[PDB]
Write a protein that binds this ligand. Structure first.
Ligand SMILES: CCCCCCCCCCCCCCCCC[C@@H](O)O[C@H](CO[C@H](O)CCCCCCCCCCCCCCC)COP(=O)(O)OCC[N+](C)(C)C
Lengths: 70, 175
């Protein structure tokens, strides 16, 4: 009576634990991947992150400048 | 009683001597036994009969749980969390079963020690050897793992034992 009224079967806890373990394992591998990606991006600078600003080339004046040799 | 399997828990045929009254003096043991039967066993037997016939009117069953076999830790990937989990649970269940096997053997040994009386040193040799073998195997299996035991630690212990055995066999055979 106690088992029927207050508790459930072992399969419920078993599968819940499996789902939780899978979720946490994916989270851990994602954290490692994010750390590695951050390290590589900061070391190289070829990714969208750590793109420090540079001088815009649209500000340059392309016209004769009173002197042929610029 | 048919409640437990007689083969798992063996008992001797239990031979007992017949009464041999040498004299005509009436002993008190038989009279006390008869009177104890008369005003103890009969009411107890009647009460048990009543309870049993009450039970028979409401008969229902309960079942032993069977568990399927799952791949062990020896065929589990390095970071496969689900297979590792299943292997760990199976290993824990097997560990409990092994503990209960050791318990059964110990119970048989204790029963032999009590039953055989003074000759327990001679008549309980077989049970002693069975317990020695089971205890040695159990110690090889699960001993010294620690509080945080796991399937992986037991596998590492077994691998180390096999490496030592292989080294010893290679040294001895080539000698
Ligand atoms: C002859 C009898 C011998 C045995 C007696 C046993 C006594 C049992 C009483 C103790 C109860 C406490 C154990 C569990 C309580 C909380 C556990 C909780 O999980 O159960 C809830 C249910 O518990 C009850 O609702 C609460 C118990 C309180 C009743 C105790 C009686 C006395 C309380 C006093 C009240 C005061 C009244 C005013 C006084 C003036 C809901 O369960 P749920 O999470 O869905 O489970 C889902 C699985 N399903 C689908 C199979 C159901």
């Amino acid at each position: 009576w106690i088992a029927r009224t207050f508790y459930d079967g072992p399969e419920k806890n078993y599968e819940k634990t499996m789902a939780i373990l899978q979720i946490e394992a994916e989270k851990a591998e994602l954290r490692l991947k994010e750390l590695e990606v951050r390290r590589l991006m900061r070391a190289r600078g070829d990714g969208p992150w750590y793109q420090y600003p540079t001088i815009d080339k649209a500000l340059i004046d392309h016209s004769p400048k009173t002197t042929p040799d610029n | 009683p048919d409640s437990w399997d007689k083969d798992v828990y063996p008992e001797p045929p239990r031979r007992t001597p017949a009464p041999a009254p040498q004299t005509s003096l009436p002993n008190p043991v038989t009279y006390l036994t008869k009177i104890f039967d008369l005003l103890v066993d009969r009411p107890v037997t009647l009460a048990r009969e009543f309870i049993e016939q009450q039970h028979a009117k409401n008969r229902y069953y309960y079942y032993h749980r069977e568990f399927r076999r799952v791949p062990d830790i020896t065929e589990c990937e390095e970071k496969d969390i689900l297979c590792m989990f299943e292997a760990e649970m199976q290993w824990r269940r097997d560990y409990k079963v092994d503990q209960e096997i050791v318990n059964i053997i110990q119970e048989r040994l204790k029963a032999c020690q009590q039953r055989e009386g003074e000759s327990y040193r001679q008549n309980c040799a077989k049970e002693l050897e069975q317990f020695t073998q089971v205890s040695k195997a159990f110690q090889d299996r699960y001993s010294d793992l620690g509080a945080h035991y796991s399937a992986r630690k037991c596998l590492a212990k077994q691998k180390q034992r096999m490496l030592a055995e292989r080294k010893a066999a290679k040294e001895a055979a080539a000698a």
